Amino acid sequence: MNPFASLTLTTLTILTIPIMMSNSNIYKTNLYPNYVKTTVSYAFTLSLVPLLMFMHTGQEMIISNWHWMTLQTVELSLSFKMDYFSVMFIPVALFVTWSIMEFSMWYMHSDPFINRFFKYLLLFLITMMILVTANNLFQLFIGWEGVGIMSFLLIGWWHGRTDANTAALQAILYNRIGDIGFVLSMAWFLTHSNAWDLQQIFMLNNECPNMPLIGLLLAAAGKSAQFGLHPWLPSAMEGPTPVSALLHSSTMVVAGVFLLIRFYPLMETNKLVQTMTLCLGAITTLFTALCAITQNDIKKIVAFSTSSQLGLMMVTIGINQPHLAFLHICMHAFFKAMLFMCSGSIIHSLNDEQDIRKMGGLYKAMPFTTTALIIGSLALTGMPYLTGFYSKDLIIEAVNMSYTNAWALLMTLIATSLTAAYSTRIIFFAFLGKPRFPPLVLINENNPLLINSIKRLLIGSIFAGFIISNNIPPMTVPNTTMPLYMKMTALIVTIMGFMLALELNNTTYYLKFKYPSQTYKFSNMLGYYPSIMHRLPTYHNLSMSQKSASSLLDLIWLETILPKTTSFIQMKMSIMVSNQKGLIKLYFLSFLITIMISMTLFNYHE
Amino acid sequence: SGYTPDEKLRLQQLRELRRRWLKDQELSPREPVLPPRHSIFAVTHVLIPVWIIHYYLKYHVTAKPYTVVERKPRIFPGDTILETGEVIPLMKEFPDQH
Amino acid sequence: SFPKYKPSRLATLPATLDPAEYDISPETRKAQAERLAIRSRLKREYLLQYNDPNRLGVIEDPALIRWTYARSANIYPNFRPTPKTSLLGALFGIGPLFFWYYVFKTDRDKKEKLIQEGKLDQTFNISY
Amino acid sequence: HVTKDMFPGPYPKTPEERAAAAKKYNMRVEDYEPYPDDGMGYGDYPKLPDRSQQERDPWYDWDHPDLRLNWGEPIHWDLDMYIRNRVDTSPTPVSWNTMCKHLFGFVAFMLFMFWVGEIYPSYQPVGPKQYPYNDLYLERGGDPTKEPEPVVHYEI
Amino acid sequence: AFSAPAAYLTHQQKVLRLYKRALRHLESWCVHRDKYRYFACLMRARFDEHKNEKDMVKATQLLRQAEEEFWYGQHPQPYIFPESPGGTSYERYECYKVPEWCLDDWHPSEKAMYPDYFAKREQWKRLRRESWEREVKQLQEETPPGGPRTEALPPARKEGDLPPLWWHIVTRPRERPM
Amino acid sequence: MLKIIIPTTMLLPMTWMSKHNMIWINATVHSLLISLISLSLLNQLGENSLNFSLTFFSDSLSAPLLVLTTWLLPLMLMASQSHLSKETTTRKKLYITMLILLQLFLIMTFTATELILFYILFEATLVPTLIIITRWGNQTERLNAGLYFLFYTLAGSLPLLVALVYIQNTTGSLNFLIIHYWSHPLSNSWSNIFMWLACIMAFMVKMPLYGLHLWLPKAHVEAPIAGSMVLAAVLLKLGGYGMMRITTILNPLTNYMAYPFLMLSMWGMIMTSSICLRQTDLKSLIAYSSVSHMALVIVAIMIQTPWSFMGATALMIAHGLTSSMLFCLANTNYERVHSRTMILARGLQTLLPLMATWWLVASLTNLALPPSINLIGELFIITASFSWSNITIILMGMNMMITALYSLYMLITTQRGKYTHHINNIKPSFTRENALMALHILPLLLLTLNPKMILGPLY
Numbered sequence A: 001m002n003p004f005a006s007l008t009l010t011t012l013t014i015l016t017i018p019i020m021m022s023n024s025n026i027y028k029t030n031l032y033p034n035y036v037k038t039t040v041s042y043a044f045t046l047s048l049v050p051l052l053m054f055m056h057t058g059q060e061m062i063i064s065n066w067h068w069m070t071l072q073t074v075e076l077s078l079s080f081k082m083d084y085f086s087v088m089f090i091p092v093a094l095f096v097t098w099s100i101m102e103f104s105m106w107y108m109h110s111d112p113f114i115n116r117f118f119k120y121l122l123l124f125l126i127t128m129m130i131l132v133t134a135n136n137l138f139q140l141f142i143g144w145e146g147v148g149i150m151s152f153l154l155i156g157w158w159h160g161r162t163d164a165n166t167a168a169l170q171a172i173l174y175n176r177i178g179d180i181g182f183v184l185s186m187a188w189f190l191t192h193s194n195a196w197d198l199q200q201i202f203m204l205n206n207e208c209p210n211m212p213l214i215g216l217l218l219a220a221a222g223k224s225a226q227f228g229l230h231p232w233l234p235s236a237m238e239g240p241t242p243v244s245a246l247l248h249s250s251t252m253v254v255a256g257v258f259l260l261i262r263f264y265p266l267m268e269t270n271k272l273v274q275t276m277t278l279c280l281g282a283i284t285t286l287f288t289a290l291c292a293i294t295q296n297d298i299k300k301i302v303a304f305s306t307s308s309q310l311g312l313m314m315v316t317i318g319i320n321q322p323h324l325a326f327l328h329i330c331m332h333a334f335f336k337a338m339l340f341m342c343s344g345s346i347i348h349s350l351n352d353e354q355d356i357r358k359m360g361g362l363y364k365a366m367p368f369t370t371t372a373l374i375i376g377s378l379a380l381t382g383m384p385y386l387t388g389f390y391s392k393d394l395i396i397e398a399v400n401m402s403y404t405n406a407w408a409l410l411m412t413l414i415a416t417s418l419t420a421a422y423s424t425r426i427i428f429f430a431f432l433g434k435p436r437f438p439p440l441v442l443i444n445e446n447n448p449l450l451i452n453s454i455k456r457l458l459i460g461s462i463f464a465g466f467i468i469s470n471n472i473p474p475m476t477v478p479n480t481t482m483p484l485y486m487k488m489t490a491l492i493v494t495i496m497g498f499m500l501a502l503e504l505n506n507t508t509y510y511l512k513f514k515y516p517s518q519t520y521k522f523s524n525m526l527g528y529y530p531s532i533m534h535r536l537p538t539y540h541n542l543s544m545s546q547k548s549a550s551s552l553l554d555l556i557w558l559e560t561i562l563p564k565t566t567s568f569i570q571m572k573m574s575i576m577v578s579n580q581k582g583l584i585k586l587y588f589l590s591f592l593i594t595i596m597i598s599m600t601l602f603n604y605h606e
Numbered sequence B: 001s002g003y004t005p006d007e008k009l010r011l012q013q014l015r016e017l018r019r020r021w022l023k024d025q026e027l028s029p030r031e032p033v034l035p036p037r038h039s040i041f042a043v044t045h046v047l048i049p050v051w052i053i054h055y056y057l058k059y060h061v062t063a064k065p066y067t068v069v070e071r072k073p074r075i076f077p078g079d080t081i082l083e084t085g086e087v088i089p090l091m092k093e094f095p096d097q098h
Numbered sequence C: 001s002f003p004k005y006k007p008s009r010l011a012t013l014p015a016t017l018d019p020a021e022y023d024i025s026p027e028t029r030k031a032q033a034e035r036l037a038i039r040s041r042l043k044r045e046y047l048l049q050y051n052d053p054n055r056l057g058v059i060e061d062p063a064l065i066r067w068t069y070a071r072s073a074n075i076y077p078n079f080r081p082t083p084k085t086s087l088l089g090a091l092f093g094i095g096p097l098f099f100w101y102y103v104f105k106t107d108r109d110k111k112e113k114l115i116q117e118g119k120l121d122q123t124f125n126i127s128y
Numbered sequence D: 001h002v003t004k005d006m007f008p009g010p011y012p013k014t015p016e017e018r019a020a021a022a023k024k025y026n027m028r029v030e031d032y033e034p035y036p037d038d039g040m041g042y043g044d045y046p047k048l049p050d051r052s053q054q055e056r057d058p059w060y061d062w063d064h065p066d067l068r069l070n071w072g073e074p075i076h077w078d079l080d081m082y083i084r085n086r087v088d089t090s091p092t093p094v095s096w097n098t099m100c101k102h103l104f105g106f107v108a109f110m111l112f113m114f115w116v117g118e119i120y121p122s123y124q125p126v127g128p129k130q131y132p133y134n135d136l137y138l139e140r141g142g143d144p145t146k147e148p149e150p151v152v153h154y155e156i
Numbered sequence E: 001a002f003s004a005p006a007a008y009l010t011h012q013q014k015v016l017r018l019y020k021r022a023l024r025h026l027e028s029w030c031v032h033r034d035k036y037r038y039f040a041c042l043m044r045a046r047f048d049e050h051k052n053e054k055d056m057v058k059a060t061q062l063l064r065q066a067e068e069e070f071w072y073g074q075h076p077q078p079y080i081f082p083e084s085p086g087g088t089s090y091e092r093y094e095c096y097k098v099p100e101w102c103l104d105d106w107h108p109s110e111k112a113m114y115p116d117y118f119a120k121r122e123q124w125k126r127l128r129r130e131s132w133e134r135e136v137k138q139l140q141e142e143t144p145p146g147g148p149r150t151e152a153l154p155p156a157r158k159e160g161d162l163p164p165l166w167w168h169i170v171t172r173p174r175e176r177p178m
Numbered sequence F: 001m002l003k004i005i006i007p008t009t010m011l012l013p014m015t016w017m018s019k020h021n022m023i024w025i026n027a028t029v030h031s032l033l034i035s036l037i038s039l040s041l042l043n044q045l046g047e048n049s050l051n052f053s054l055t056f057f058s059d060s061l062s063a064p065l066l067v068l069t070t071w072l073l074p075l076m077l078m079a080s081q082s083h084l085s086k087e088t089t090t091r092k093k094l095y096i097t098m099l100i101l102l103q104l105f106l107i108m109t110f111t112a113t114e115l116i117l118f119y120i121l122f123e124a125t126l127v128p129t130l131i132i133i134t135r136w137g138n139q140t141e142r143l144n145a146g147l148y149f150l151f152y153t154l155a156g157s158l159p160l161l162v163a164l165v166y167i168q169n170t171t172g173s174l175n176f177l178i179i180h181y182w183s184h185p186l187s188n189s190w191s192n193i194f195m196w197l198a199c200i201m202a203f204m205v206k207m208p209l210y211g212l213h214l215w216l217p218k219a220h221v222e223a224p225i226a227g228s229m230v231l232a233a234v235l236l237k238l239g240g241y242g243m244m245r246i247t248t249i250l251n252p253l254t255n256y257m258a259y260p261f262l263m264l265s266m267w268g269m270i271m272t273s274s275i276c277l278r279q280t281d282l283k284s285l286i287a288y289s290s291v292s293h294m295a296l297v298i299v300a301i302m303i304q305t306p307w308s309f310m311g312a313t314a315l316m317i318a319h320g321l322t323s324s325m326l327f328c329l330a331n332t333n334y335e336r337v338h339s340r341t342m343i344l345a346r347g348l349q350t351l352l353p354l355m356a357t358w359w360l361v362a363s364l365t366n367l368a369l370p371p372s373i374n375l376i377g378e379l380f381i382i383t384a385s386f387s388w389s390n391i392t393i394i395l396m397g398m399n400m401m402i403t404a405l406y407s408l409y410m411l412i413t414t415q416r417g418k419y420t421h422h423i424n425n426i427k428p429s430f431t432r433e434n435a436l437m438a439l440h441i442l443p444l445l446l447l448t449l450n451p452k453m454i455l456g457p458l459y
């Protein structure tokens, strides 16, 4: 038999073995995190082989190994799609998870439940692999909700902290709204195409109507934190930094984009949903970028950067460039995970401080962290011949040269400048200048776990773009002919962002003080979206849920109409019937009345 | 300004008590009185699972129609088929705009 | 001088912006002392049971019991059929039911008379 | 041990009833004010200020520190709505009715501009892409028995 | 956190608290140390300008308009110490705090490990049991007839007395309990 | 069917002749044995039901319900023996006798061939339940709860009796097979409209339909733990089973007589789910959740499609397991702290970790996480409703969100945060409680592997 299927399935199978060993003796020892890390590294090196097979001959496969259940004309089977997307995304995710687990072995060393933490990370990885390789919509929904619940459990890691529980429930709430659209898509696809698998859906939908695509778009907007349902991603920074580095920056967050990429044959047949996807993406990238440039918490800045890049992925899905969008997902994983790990090393060195206003001159104190964060910032901004460059510069080129909404294009360019500005803010504030942290200096980045993990993602962020771009078949008709000014548009915009952010940051040394502009207050308080949307709908819903549903209806009117009325009436009739004075005169008088009535209204009637 | 006499005295007493308690939370040298191969990982975690899966796919899953479907391989002008020994003729003498 | 801050329901007025805490009279101070005394008597009553060595169990709180009783069992004894109560009950009770009846009945009538016309695109719709 | 006169009752109208009620809830009779006497069913229970639990002093030594409550104190009718996992009424830097204006204005401006950019798209000065075999007629769903109309392109 | 509160804040306490808040928010606005130091001295001076005012009414109005200025000019995102009530580590270790009474429900096999710790715990329990009644009696002695007036507690006054209501203050779990 | 029934009856004198200290052991062992024997009814022919005799028959609709009943009895015994320890030997035997009589009535009701026998057993289930609630209920409010449970049920079921005897006079039979094979359309007349209502309202009040649901919070909250377990797991499903059986003689009238019940069930789904968000009592919250789930089942039965019937069967079974587990979980804490208020005990994960795991799993199946059978049933019903009308997705979508909200709210309020300082009597979890939770949970998870067993006749 062909090796391709056995290796692709073994890659996902061996990831479940440390979960099976969870009840075993190894879990109670201090050897468990290293064991999980080693397992993940072996899974990565194994998944490297099917990638080679595809890059050589373009091999793709689907495996329907187990039949689960059959409803009359519909057959549900455990099926795995092992196309380009699966075999390319599996090794990237395994590589990033390997780096972040090696990082966690250092960052989370004094946590008393580090074993549980490692188990939780592994559970997330398994559910994400399920999400990515699924061939029908039910299995994809399993992976969907699984990463949702692992996100909930990992955000509320420190469950004694109220803000963590709030952020976890917020992620669940926003996701549920997105889920609504997922379930709508499933129902439409079953009552119209009579299937849940991708194959039958592609055959039977040559002209896909609006409703299933709008369901898929709602699902993607929820899962990828787009402008309607965006606020949960920055608030998910309540979790430990490794959770943020893997789950909320480079892997789980791209699922909505990945869902839209899985269904691109249907979306290229509908221009309305493409317009909607493009517009939603354009507003999201610009808005998140705008909120990021005034934030003082380092994790918040990187989370808003992640939201902005997800918006960019959605705009490149909107211009009918699914393959290009997928490439960015792979490229962005490397350097965004590295950026989060660098922020984490900083936070741990500075006694769990995350505000950049108390981080001084670390350019010399933390040389390796500085090198890595600078290289990651240059990859994020699209520096030439870097991983970021192939993915982002091509996206800007394609958005410039397509029949596209003009406002979306303008917002995309402004966001491309904003990206340079926020990156500049982090470097200027965190690494340059004089120290602003407390005097007991505990700075120490001399741990081989941290250095090795960050160096691994650093080599990735430098070379993966070139290697991956040159080792895949071309699915895109390249833009070869464009005006020089248009060609330099990404570069021109990025340099403008660099220069203007650096100017406005240099002007903060001056001994001059002014009160904040209203645009500043809008940018810093996140457009007041969480101030209003997290108080007004929640208040009104909870208030109506008590005052109207609970009290006015259940406790009062539903009681009044059926049971209380019955009791009151029967009580009145019992009092009327039974309260006789016991005088035979009165009883006998009635008997006379009764006798007269019967012999007249009964005896005259025959 | 500052503490009252009773406040300071009570804080001192509570401080002494608390420091004694924290001191006595320490463990003695014996406290946890407990009552009474190089390549082994790659063979039980990679080799054994791939034996079970390849056996399962080769003899059970592929024993039924349409369970493992591979998209058919690309053919190019000038390629030679393996089964029939066919040769697909090349492609029409390009205008050669060198 | 500076632009003023106006409070609302979901963003209340800060204490330092409250004109009431800057207009102090002796009666206000006596009220504050009374409140502190009430808080103090309650605190001592709680701490005497909290620190008791011989006390095992859950200290019972009459304020919590009053809250749950008022929120569940005391509601119907204190209900009166009022124009407000009756109108709100009718609205929030039967309004939505008729709204949804109209919506669903309209949609299904459209769909059925569309099927009678031979016009719906029902191909491949075997499962229902 | 919570006897019968410990429990909320009907709306008090005499001042002696108001005094008994205020004492039952551990309040000053000057502070205790019940809900208006409509038929809502609030009855005896006190109408406390509508602040959240997030607004309370976090530096005080509460009996229930995360709830920010003291044992025996009157509990707000809507405690479970204000537990600070939930609705927050804390004062904000910018006024409500100013945040609302800015948010609504931003969103309305973005929607208007996206509709405008839909009317006025961007494109390149190019002709429609051309495809060889009658615009790939057999490729895009075929039906090879109905003689498509010849789509023929000319060099330029 | 440790001190019993009073019925109200004096004008002086309000003024000091406003001073501290203004300084902290100014430091939030003035990131760098030198610029903050400059503007903090300017703040201290502007604060000292009205230091020796005798008219209580005008002092109150100065405090009021100062509070209005602070509210209009506050930082929307002031710096918070990580373990402070708004910090990113505020209640991070509350899931690790286990009450000490849980140790009595341990299995005897669990207490077989750690014999010395549990002997010393039995000593502490003896101490509390033999101090309780004196604590109650002392609190009844030193307290006015109309109940206590503040949340303040008296110290021990005799030879071998302990400050009343000390057990749950002395036996706090820890602030990094694991 | 006799092989299952006689041993169940035998359980009666076995417990009456047992030694005072062996009643729980004996009853539990032989209840489990009976459950194992019953497990053999899941083999179904396909085209038709298994007709053992003229009096009894088993279906694919029926088989899952019987196995759940027999499995629930030993769990009720495990849950009861803690709070019944102080009771006299005779009263403990009487309590066990009530549970056994309830199991016996339930098994017969599901397998009776004709409607009059089904009606008699379906009504006989009222007596042991009422006795359990009113005699062993902890609170004073139990007496009121018993009256509400009785009267709401009889006010629906007596018109059903009249309708059934009328139908046998006009048709000649009430045997379900004859009823099915000789089915004829119901004309659109006032007589037929009232016959439809009299055939439907008893099962509606059993479900319960929204607005006729007020008996359920009372009865489920005031009952002892085993009473609550059997009231939520099995007794609610009598309405669904009876409706699925009876709607064969009601066509084509159901096409428009179902409109008000569909409106009530969808909007009241939203209503009861929202109510769960502001609940101070922990049992009250689980009761209203049951209401919300049964509203979904009512919709599924009213729209009369094969997918909706499959979803209804799966949801009935899954709800029966999950709701019983949630009631037992709440009862453990109640046993600790002797109060039902949800905010009394907080941060219990710090004190009881394995019980927190049980809490998490029960809360995850309550919100229908894939690929649990709760989601299988809910998804099938939602698809059928979408086919019925595309606008149902809005209501269905809203319900899914509110359910996640209150499920995780309950989990977070009881397990997370910090523990109440004053309560110091929270002892470690007993082996009995952990085993009870596992015996609820393992069967549900096992059911995912073989979904068809709980799917029903339509499958």
Ligand SMILES: CCCCCCCCCCCCCCCCC[C@@H](O)O[C@H](CO[C@H](O)CCCCCCCCCCCCCCC)COP(=O)(O)OCC[N+](C)(C)C
Residues within 6 Å of the ligand: F188, F189, F190, F193, F210, F211, F212, F257, F260, F261
């Ligand atoms: C709180 C929860 C309680 C449980 C919910 C119970 C729900 C019961 C509702 C019954 C559903 C509908 C009943 C009958 C169907 C149609 C009703 C009628 O209004 O329709 C028209 C009937 O026309 C008029 O409306 C006549 C009926 C009007 C008199 C009834 C009084 C309704 C007022 C509402 C009282 C509330 C009832 C429930 C008490 C709690 C149709 O026109 P027509 O084609 O000619 O008649 C069809 C019958 N034919 C064929 C024999 C001729």
Ligand SMILES: CCCCCCCC/C=C/CCCCCCCC(=O)OC[C@H](COP(=O)(O)OCCN)OC(=O)CCCCCCC/C=C/CCCCCCCC
Residues within 6 Å of the ligand: A163, A166, A167, A169, A170, A173, A177, A180, A217, A218, A221, A226, A227, A228, A229, A235, A280, A530, A533, A534, A535, A537, A538, A541, A542, D085, D086, D087, F397, F398, F401, F405
């Ligand atoms: C489409 C169907 C659903 C649409 C939405 C309908 C309205 C939903 C209303 C939800 C009511 C839930 C009430 C109970 C929630 C629990 C209480 C709660 O969560 O408190 C608020 C809690 C705490 O606030 P924080 O700021 O995070 O605190 C940090 C400092 N401590 O935050 C929240 O979780 C509130 C979340 C409410 C979201 C409501 C706004 C969402 C609006 C979405 C509309 C746009 C859709 C997107 C369109 C995409 C393009 C196709």
Ligand SMILES: CCCCCCCC/C=C\CCCCCCCC(=O)O[C@H](COC(=O)CCCCCCC/C=C/CCCCCCCC)COP(=O)(O)OCCN
Residues within 6 Å of the ligand: F151, F152, F153, F154, F155, F156, F159, F162, F163, F166, F190, F191, F192, F194, F195, F197, F198, F199, F201, F205, F212
């Ligand atoms: C816990 C609350 C539950 C309340 C349930 C109440 C509703 C039950 C449904 C209606 C009850 C009575 C129906 C009668 C039983 C059916 C018998 C039948 O079908 O015979 C009809 C007879 O139909 C009737 O006579 C019924 C008339 C109604 C008499 C009693 C009225 C009681 C109230 C009616 C409305 C309430 C029903 C819905 C309320 C639901 C609960 C809120 C036709 O037979 P013929 O007489 O031969 O006619 C053809 C030959 N000429």
